Design an enzyme around this catalytic site. Structure first.
Site, PDB file in Angstrom:
ATOM      1  N   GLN A   1      -3.880   5.829   5.896  1.00 18.29           N
ATOM      2  CA  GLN A   1      -3.392   4.977   4.859  1.00 18.29           C
ATOM      3  C   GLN A   1      -2.541   5.481   4.287  1.00 18.29           C
ATOM      4  OE1 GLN A   1      -7.613   5.979   3.201  1.00 18.29           O
ATOM      5  NE2 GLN A   1      -6.020   5.922   1.330  1.00 18.29           N
TER       6      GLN A   1
ATOM      7  N   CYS B   1      -7.699   2.261   1.348  1.00 25.05           N
ATOM      8  CA  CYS B   1      -8.895   2.420   1.961  1.00 25.05           C
ATOM      9  C   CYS B   1      -9.779   1.061   2.195  1.00 25.05           C
ATOM     10  CB  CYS B   1      -9.755   3.526   1.750  1.00 25.05           C
ATOM     11  SG  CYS B   1     -10.612   3.379  -0.060  1.00 25.05           S
TER      12      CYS B   1
ATOM     13  N   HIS C   1     -14.430   6.049  -2.059  1.00 25.73           N
ATOM     14  CA  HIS C   1     -13.566   6.158  -0.985  1.00 25.73           C
ATOM     15  C   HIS C   1     -14.600   5.044   0.195  1.00 25.73           C
ATOM     16  CE1 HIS C   1     -10.649   7.178   2.391  1.00 25.73           C
ATOM     17  NE2 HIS C   1     -11.565   7.583   3.102  1.00 25.73           N
TER      18      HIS C   1
ATOM     19  N   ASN D   1     -12.668   7.302   9.633  1.00 22.00           N
ATOM     20  CA  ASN D   1     -11.767   7.362   8.527  1.00 22.00           C
ATOM     21  C   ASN D   1     -10.352   7.238   8.661  1.00 22.00           C
ATOM     22  OD1 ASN D   1     -11.576   8.124   5.741  1.00 22.00           O
ATOM     23  ND2 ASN D   1     -11.656  10.352   6.199  1.00 22.00           N
TER      24      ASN D   1
END
Lengths: 212, 98
Positions: free
Chosen positions: A19, A25, A159, A175
């Site tokens: 990202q 995110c 997150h 992730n």
């Protein structure tokens, strides 16, 4: 539900992305669940555009943060383009959907998992990839390089990531930090602790797309 | 819920000042100004694929500048970067996202 789920092993999960320096995110998290439900439903594994949600979700604040739910909602109301068509730039620009012709696909809606409930979460992950939140601000989190994360971390969740599978004592997360973090971009985070927030707040806030 | 927003404004630590002082020169070279005084006063963080720091630095007299500093993931071992700055800022101007 099985002892083990790994949606990667069922071809439902696209490569690990990055990202960058934008707080996007929530865009990323949403997209993994979109790619997962569409493969599960259609037999096809595609990549869809995070940069479109970033530009186009007007309930979210671009690189300054935002919500997976409203991003999943946008795709249930309108649709999404392919990633190749609307590629990630790491900065919010104007929303360019209309000048990219028709949406490649669409979902029917969004549901929310019942929060603070491990079993609830695992049942949904046994169906498809789910959007979950955690606390990633900590140095141990950032320093993670493998194994089953038990902390330390608090439950000041900041997150949005995606849960792409589980086992007996972890939940497997994709992730958005690159593959040079953690276990090739993945982290296995401890479950079963009797902590109801989950580890790193993992059971706070979880949504998945509905699509047939 | 709301993922990816900076933290609330926290008052500078030694870490804050060291992070500023790393980037001092880059500022000075972009602004074509030498800052005699360079004191971190406040901060916010946000968690990205790394960490953005938003820093209010007392530079001047009653004169401040806000810094947007990128710190990489540890495993990347890249130096701190001044991604952006704001000038002519006040003691009481809020550290906001930019």
């Amino acid at each position: 539900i099985p002892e083990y789920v790994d949606w990667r092993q069922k071809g439902a999960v696209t490569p690990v992305k990055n990202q960058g320096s934008c707080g996007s995110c929530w865009a990323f998290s949403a997209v993994v669940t979109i790619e997962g439900i569409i493969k599960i439903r259609t037999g096809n594994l595609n990549q869809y555009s995070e940069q479109e949600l970033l530009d186009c979700d007007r309930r979210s604040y671009g690189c300054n943060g935002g919500y997976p739910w409203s991003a999943l909602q946008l795709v249930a109301q309108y649709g999404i383009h392919y990633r190749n068509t609307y590629p990630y730039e790491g900065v919010q620009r104007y929303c360019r959907s209309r000048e990219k012709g028709p949406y490649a696909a669409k979902t029917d809606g969004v549901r929310q998992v019942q929060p603070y409930n491990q079993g609830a979460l695992l049942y949904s992950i046994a169906n498809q990839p789910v959007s979950v939140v955690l606390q990633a601000a900590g140095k141990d989190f950032q320093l993670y390089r493998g194994g089953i994360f038990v902390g330390p971390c608090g439950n000041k969740v900041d997150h949005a990531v995606a849960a792409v599978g589980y086992g007996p004592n972890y939940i497997l997360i994709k992730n958005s930090w690159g593959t040079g973090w953690g276990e090739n971009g993945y982290i296995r985070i401890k479950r079963g602790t009797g902590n109801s927030y989950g580890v790193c707040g993992l059971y706070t806030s979880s949504f998945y797309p509905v699509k047939n | 819920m709301m993922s990816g927003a900076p933290s609330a404004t926290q008052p500078a630590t030694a870490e804050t000042q060291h992070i500023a002082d790393q980037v001092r020169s880059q500022l000075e070279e972009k602004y074509n100004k030498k800052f005699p005084v360079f004191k971190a006063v406040s901060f916010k963080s946000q968690v990205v694929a790394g960490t953005n720091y938003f820093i209010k630095v007392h530079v001047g007299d009653e004169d401040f500048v806000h810094l947007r500093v990128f710190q990489s993931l540890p495993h990347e071992n890249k130096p701190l970067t001044l991604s952006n700055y704001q000038t002519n800022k006040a003691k009481h101007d809020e550290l906001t996202y930019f």
